[PDB]
Amino acid sequence: MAAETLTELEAAIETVVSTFFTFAGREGRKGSLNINEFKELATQQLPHLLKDVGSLDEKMKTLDVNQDSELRFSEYWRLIGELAKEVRKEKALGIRKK
């Protein structure tokens, strides 16, 4: 089949949204999340296993990029490239069969 609406994966959206995206709280209104606690990302995610390497500058620019990395209003499309942040490197590392 095709990926029309929210597939079973939406249930997963609850984790990703209830985890880091909860930092939305930083911004008063109940619109979106910004890049305040996001700063807790590259920093804390810096030393991973198969780390990517949160380049300082990248960590700076990306703010504007994934500004609304989380959303309460319409910027949920931001999560689009978010949930992938995990899958990206996980594409290769996924090869548990080495």
Added chain:
Amino acid sequence: MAAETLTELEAAIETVVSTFFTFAGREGRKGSLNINEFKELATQQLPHLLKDVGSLDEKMKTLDVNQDSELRFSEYWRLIGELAKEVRKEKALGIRKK
């Protein structure tokens, strides 16, 4: 900060992977998941709330597209556009503040 390695969202990868992606088992080897139970997607996800409309043909072609929608070996990048399948429509619907 920037989305270098696996951010807190990776924890969410567990749901999406442990939910629908568990259909991988369809394929003997422990490499990847295909499009057998995926056929349970558009079909079941068909009648959603803000449904997208799993077009029959689309549901057919998408197979090849999201073939390894799930992965045990390297096709995890497939999940890249997967976890988003939820976020996509959820971008607008996200607007609980209407």
